[model samples]
Target: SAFDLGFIRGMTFGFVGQHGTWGTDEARASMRALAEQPFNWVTLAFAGLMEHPGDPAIAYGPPVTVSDDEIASMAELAHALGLKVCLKPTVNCRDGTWRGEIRFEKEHGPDLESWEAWFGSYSDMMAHYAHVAKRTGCEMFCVGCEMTTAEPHEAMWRETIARVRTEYDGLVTYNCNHGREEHVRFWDAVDLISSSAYYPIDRWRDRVPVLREVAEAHEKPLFFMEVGCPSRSGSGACPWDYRHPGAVCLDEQARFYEAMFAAMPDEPWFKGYMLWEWPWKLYPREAASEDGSYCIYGKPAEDVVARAFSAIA
Candidate 1:
């Protein structure tokens, strides 16, 4: 049976915990555990490595990344468990920088130092996953994740999304950086609008209207492709700053979860969330209260999230 896209309860699975681990029995158990929750969706993401921010090449394939067979198996399992799957091929700039910071000074077409070369390398990777997405029955394919600088080049992204479509026949999306929603020129090219919804707890009511405006302008459904705060005191103020140094404050994380759901208005285009993460190697439930990472499993934050998802009619 097919499910409605009106509201989705999802969590991003296998982000940092990915590599060769997706083929493990433990990975299945962790995913099974996620299925036992209120979530009806999962995003299985793996890294495509870029050695430096300005490098126009991406290295991805068997040993260094998730295998195609592994993606097929996992997506198959998620379906059997009745969860819609989204395959997110997120890039990691291995040279101590974020993938969003990848930028080049020169704008030559298809030249090594130009944006065209970078998008060509990236589109090949997208096409690879697009095939996997079509083969494995994934319902959604994210074109890019937080590619901050790359979002501006309208022609480049149109070509990239079109390339993905040449291989994939599923819903397409791009996970834009949180505050940069309306600024992206390529929203017209994707099937839906998504973002890393990492607003400070205090900013949700104010910022959400702005987000809603963008989605309304584009007239596409909106959802948080990524959202969550660490279990630390100051994290509620800067949820995107994962490296914030603060005391172990589980309540702050819980409060943010509560606010995340509470802040949603009556707009029907306001789809649900894909929480920041749940790890392949879950921490012991016994230590969840003290663990300060973004994984919500067995934490107070999980309780808040569960209630919110359950309350959706």
Candidate 2:
């Protein structure tokens, strides 16, 4: 039975916890800010699964021991403020070997067995998170995030969703890391199809069409799970290029969001989106050059997101 989640036109405020860096207070504050803009939902990735399953990695990395106390507190506050909470793990960036289990690494140039082992380990990790979500009131759970290396294991993806559903009884979404090509047939059992749409509107430029294409794939609603451009003064490659360093222009950032909304009007199956990193610590210049920069509270991106939230109907 589906829980009566009231009327959800869409969700507006959220952050992608690349390594689960934000604190409870930070989460609550961010959610409150989102609530003020009046976004109805927030999602947080809960890290803490080192290697295969038994093996562990660096000690102080993302809290090997998972704790929902802070998350639960944040969820309660968000609920009071009329916001929903989506919790999942962002375990894609970590290779399976360092932490301990045997897995494969397609991108790392290894034997196919390494890749198979890696995926198998990921399946185990998803099941583990499902167990955690089942215990908590987690409304939405993301099983994977941008496993471009493991995209070939279509069967594993399907199985991971199935296993998660068996344990958790809420929404499920995966962070498809902007590589639009891999997700076309991956939404068989997921409740919502989501992606970290960091595609640069300034250059690769076809972001709108790509979103539309994803929408056309399934009958279910589509979500641009994560979207945002860095707020740097100077730029090298366009905002979309992963290698670009420095912040993006505020005006350009604003235009990027406006274009997104303009492109994705009131399509029924189109859900909403969550901007990346409100308070992302240790921002990687290569991946998130705008770290310590982008914000909806003060920056141009913030204004754009807030305006988009209110304007998009």
Candidate 3:
């Protein structure tokens, strides 16, 4: 049987809790606005694992800071409008930081007891999400996001998948942070392989053929779960740093997307793609760059996505 759930012929929008917008009415408004565009599914900030009680899991608080009723209402609205919903939790790898894993990382920098406590807390939180999905009828659930550094242990990953399967029956996947096309050898246990396919413009344009060549070896469906070009000045030329927000011209972004579209192959297991994000906030949009935005609104790349998705479908 094919692991692909569907063709994924639309946009997948991501919403964050960092800007105090997730649990607010504005978050719902933003979601509604995105539905007006050509989109198929949306992933909402449903749950987050915390390292400490005071730590900001979603930048404001826990995933359910808004309320179960509110989250369920949003899911209902999305389903009513023929959209699929996926619950996502923010997790980390062994990076020697507060957010790093205790089960995976053990060093003098972070206390062992603290790591143990964090793991227990996070595991319990994921269990709560299973119940949330069962009650809310969510279509999919993402087990982890951007945990590239600590994903080597096959035993640990299998345990995580088993735990999540104990709770929900929907499609499950992990969103790799960087180097998606390269990590295929690792996450084979997943139901489907999904990655934040931020193929850098300079490298991907030349390497698209190579990417498809490598992907031919895998049997599972491949999804570019998160993809975008920056909308800051000189964003495409240099390597992106998390500290400074670079400016990218929309025309340049458009060209980047066009290049990828032209290069992508129509293989059987190649599932689909998801553009990174939508909606703009004036403050604390620092997920990509310290002071930049990645969107297709009013930018040349915005139409590129529309055209590309239409053509691929």
Q: What TM-score, to 2 decimals, does candidate 1 have?
A: 0.96
- Sequence-dependent TM-score of model 3: 0.77
Whole-model Cα lDDT of every candidate shown, in order = 0.86, 0.56, 0.58
Top candidate by TM-score: 1
lDDT of candidate 2 over 26-71, digit per residue (tens): 5556566556664666665555544443222212133543344555
Q: Which ranges of candidate 3 are over 4 A from the true structure?
A: 1-4, 9-14, 18-20, 46-66, 92-119, 180-186, 209-216, 237-243, 280-292
How much RMSD separates candidate 2 from the native structure?
Answer: 6.1
Query: Which runs of model 2 end up more than 4 angstroms from their true locations?
Result: 1-27, 48-66, 92-113, 181-184, 203-205, 234-237, 240-243, 280-292
| Each candidate's clash count | 0, 13, 5
Query: Candidate 3: global Cα-lDDT?
Result: 0.58
Candidate 1 vs candidate 3, lDDT winner = 1
| Winner by TM-score between candidate 3 and candidate 2 | 3
Q: How many clashing residue pairs, candidate 3? A: 5
lDDT of 2 at 202: 49
- On lDDT, the candidate that comes out on top is 1
- TM-score for each predicted model, relative to the true structure: 0.96, 0.74, 0.77
